[PDB]
Design a protein around this nucleic acid. Structure first.
Ligand SMILES: [Zn+2]
Lengths: 151, 101, 129, 204, 62
RNA sequence: UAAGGAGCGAAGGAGGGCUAGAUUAUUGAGCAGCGAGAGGUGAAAUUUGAUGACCUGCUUAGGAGUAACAGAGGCGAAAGCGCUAGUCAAGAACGAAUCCGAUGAUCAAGGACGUAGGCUGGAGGAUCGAAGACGAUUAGAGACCGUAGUAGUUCCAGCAGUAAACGAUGCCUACGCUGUUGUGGUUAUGAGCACGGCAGAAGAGAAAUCUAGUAGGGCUUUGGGGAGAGUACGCGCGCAAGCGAUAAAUUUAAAGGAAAUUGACGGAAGAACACCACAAGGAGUGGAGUGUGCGGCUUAAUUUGACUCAACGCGGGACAGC
């Protein structure tokens, strides 16, 4: 299965959205249809291998049917900002952060993603926190950056 | 050295025989050498016959069976464990196997 | 009370997928159709007894809407010069139809056997794995 | 747009059997009788002997086939189009250590229809005998087959379809074969295996 | 809804399943002719009474 | 003549050539129904589908093939031969008071046949598929796997001449133990004759095993420690591809030479066993701060052993001096 991770919302005063490729995810086994009892951290920096030596970011055994489950992150980033931050690809009114490739499982939920904002004034806002789906900052020159209806 | 008196096949007093194709990998194997297996399987599983007794419109019903003859090459028969390696005195024992279901 | 209003149900059951399809007695009009691959996500599950069972329920529902009560079943594998054993899932379509209310008429195996045949795929050595 | 709402049911009727009506078929509604003829005529269905007769539950091994021919009001009338044995019967009959005897023959009805008939028989192992197999010699098989063809010619050639259908129902050809050929060798499972319609005469 | 049938175990046959968790048993119903074969998973003694949800579902392998 | 050839009688066999038919199946088109996926794998991608796929009906067009029955069964000089009828020649075996009378065995030279793949010309072209092209996997895959695709694969008229063309066992003719099971004829119903399979025995052989027992019967082919070499030069056939036949110089103490014995190894198979294994149940560790050991870096010096279980509060290693 392939899943695209979009960042959706109304963006004002924002040049780029950058995303940590670290996702707390809920996974379901495609063999026995049981949900994994805990969320699992899927990270781009986690290096695992399938039983056929293919690189994956997550390897998990289903506790019920013993089947292996695998997830690979493909970063959709166009560039790395400061060699650290994955710039999400702008697509019309949203940002494509990554593509998650599941084998032997379904991804049921992504819980949270750590998001950083580059403003149109070149200011970085690291680790932005949303209140009820809203984020807003003002600079010393009265330029506003905001995200509304975050999804 | 010669391992079997019959060269591992049932051909005698003939030049050549028809080939057949392996069920598992489609390899060609001579008919007189291929490992053979017989199957007689009910169309309906045993775990449903107690529902069939209330589902059917007829006063009584006999379930239809399905019939097959399957052929295997040596490699497949050994790997699927239809046959196994045996000791130098056991190799000579010949007995008919059961029909599968 | 009511007479038995009958439909035909065709079932194909290969190693890869299962297809379920209801018709009038003539075979020339279609009432409902589904497959294992319609309901499930992963490609490795399209033959699964579970995917077959989910797909059967949708077909049973549409038939109950159109007002049918009883069913004749004709079932097959792939045949020809290929495999001629009924695949997994085939025998769970039938048991599911019986848990739904439907009365079962007659069952027949209708796999196309050949008296002799064209050459099979795979070459003289066969698949190596 | 629920197209299913816009469909007309018609009842299928048959002849020369105890049960007259066997089910019903759909079509999209149409304005002109010529269209309805062109849509319904030419369709086919099949029915088990056990469903169209009142009979021993043993006789379920045979199927009859009918082709839609004519329309009158609610009813479609259908005509004989062939006979077939069920797969379970054919496959279950063949056994190791015995010989199969098989034949193909063509015949003509008085009505002008031409039919092709397939026939089967099997050798039988006699009692008070200890040899494992009961194969038949190749020249002897030709004697049986020669006899089968004169029996089929006597029974079915130049008859009406009303007569043929009842002979097939009562299984008279099988019974005659077992009686006649016993002098050559003992036999079992004698049956007409398939009947197929080849040409229908151009008629109005 | 609370349908139930009470059945008396007459024999036990085989320790069964992955890890040997189940026991194949023969059970007769208390108010019907029916006698069944079933798998049961707790410890079982002969002459126990067990409560079934179905009188029909069966483990034919016996 | 229990040597050969000619002939008679009743019968048997996927032996061969020809003529006329057949039940399905795989593809391709037409039309109708339905309205979203199909295919393929260990798991997937190429790929195809709203120009309606897939699946279910009815029509058609082609070119291959004869499933199950079907076997330590049959036939043929070998290579090889499996649907049904009709037709045309010749052969093997058996039964018996038929005819001729040495007509015979084996064979350099010479002649005829020879699976498959290949070549020259015509017919045709369903399925499969060298070459070529992609998709994956890998350090790399040009390969194995999947998609697709051409020569070929079929027929007629020819060329070619090789196979693990093997039961790796030349052809006639002898002398030879028992039991059992086949195929076709004949029968005093007791048995025989031809062609087989199987299991012991006795002899034999380096053994494994036995087409290998006994033996100055007849005739042809053929080997003489490994390599170089079935290669060079000449010659004969072939349209070509090539094939047939066949040396020296040089090098070396043995040869992955034969079979059988014991170990070590394997990515085999089969039985067993166990909360320092698991399954069903308890308490934790992996995350925080601190205590302690190990690697890395720094320093004048941060002294050192040990690394899967079976290195890391271990070296009785809680160092102010010792
Ligand atoms: Zn195989």
């Amino acid at each position: 299965m392939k899943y695209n991770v979009y960042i959706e919302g109304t963006f004002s005063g924002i040049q780029s959205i950058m995303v940590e490729q670290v996702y707390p995810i809920t996974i379901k086994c495609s063999g026995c249809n049981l949900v994994h009892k805990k969320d699992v951290i899927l990270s781009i920096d986690s290096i695992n291998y399938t039983d056929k030596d293919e690189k994956v970011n997550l390897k998990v055994k289903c506790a019920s049917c013993t089947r292996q489950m695998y997830i690979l992150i493909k970063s959709m980033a166009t560039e790395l900002y400061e060699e650290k931050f994955y710039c999400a690809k702008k697509e019309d009114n949203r940002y494509l952060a990554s593509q998650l490739q599941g084998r032997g499982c379904y991804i049921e939920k992504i819980k949270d993603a750590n998001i950083h904002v580059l403003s149109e004034k070149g200011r970085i806002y690291p680790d932005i926190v949303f209140d009820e789906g809203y984020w807003r900052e003002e600079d010393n020159m009265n330029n506003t950056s905001s995200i509304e209806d975050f999804n | 050295t010669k391992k079997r008196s019959n060269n591992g096949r049932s051909k005698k007093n003939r030049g050549h025989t028809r080939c057949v194709r392996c069920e598992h990998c489609s390899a060609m194997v001579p008919n007189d050498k291929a490992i053979k297996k017989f199957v007689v399987r009910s169309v309906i599983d045993a775990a449903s016959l107690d529902d069939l007794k209330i589902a059917t419109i007829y006063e009584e019903y006999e379930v239809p069976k399905s019939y097959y003859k399957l052929n295997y090459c040596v490699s497949c028969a050994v790997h699927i464990k239809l046959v196994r390696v045996r000791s130098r005195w056991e190799r000579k024992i010949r007995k008919e196997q059961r029909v599968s279901a | 009370e009511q007479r038995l209003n009958f439909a035909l149900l065709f079932i194909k059951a290969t190693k890869n997928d299962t297809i379920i399809h209801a018709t009038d007695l003539t075979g020339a009009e279609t009432l409902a159709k589904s497959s294992g691959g319609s309901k499930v996500k992963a490609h490795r599950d399209e033959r699964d007894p579970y995917a077959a069972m989910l797909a059967t329920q949708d077909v049973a529902a549409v038939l109950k809407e159109k007002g049918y009560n009883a069913v004749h079943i004709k079932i097959r594998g792939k045949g020809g010069n290929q495999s001629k054993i009924i695949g997994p899932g085939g025998s769970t379509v039938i048991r599911t139809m019986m848990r739904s209310e439907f009365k079962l008429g007659r069952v027949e195996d209708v796999t196309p056997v050949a008296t002799d045949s064209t050459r099979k795929k795979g070459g003289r050595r066969g698949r190596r794995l | 747009k629920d197209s299913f709402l816009k469909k007309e049911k018609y009842n299928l009727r048959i002849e020369n059997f105890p049960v007259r009506e066997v089910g019903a078929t759909l079509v999209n509604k149409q304005s002109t009788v010529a269209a309805l003829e062109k849509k319904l005529v030419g369709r086919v269905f099949e029915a088990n002997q056990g469903d169209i007769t009142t009979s021993d539950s043993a006789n379920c091994y045979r199927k009859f086939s009918f082709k839609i021919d004519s329309l009158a009001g609610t009813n479609a009338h259908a005509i004989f189009n062939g006979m077939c044995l069920t797969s379970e019967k054919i496959k279950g009959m063949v056994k190791r250590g015995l010989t199969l005897i098989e034949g193909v023959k063509d015949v003509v009805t008085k009505e002008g229809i031409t039919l092709r008939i397939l026939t089967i028989a099997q050798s039988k192992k006699e009692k008070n005998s200890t040899k494992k197999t009961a194969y038949a010699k190749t020249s002897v098989v030709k004697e049986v087959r020669k006899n089968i063809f004169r029996i089929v010619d006597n029974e079915l050639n130049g008859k009406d379809i009303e007569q043929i259908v009842k002979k097939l129902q009562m299984e008279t050809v099988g019974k005659e074969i077992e009686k006649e050929c016993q002098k050559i060798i003992p036999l079992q499972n004698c049956h007409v295996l398939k009947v197929k319609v080849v040409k229908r005469p151009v008629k109005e | 809804s609370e349908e139930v049938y009470i059945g008396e175990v007459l024999q036990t046959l085989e320790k069964t399943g992955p890890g040997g968790g189940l026991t194949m048993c023969q059970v007769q119903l208390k108010d019907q002719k029916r006698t069944l074969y079933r798998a049961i998973m707790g410890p079982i003694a002969v002459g126990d009474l067990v409560a079934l949800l179905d009188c029909e579902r069966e483990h034919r392998r016996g």
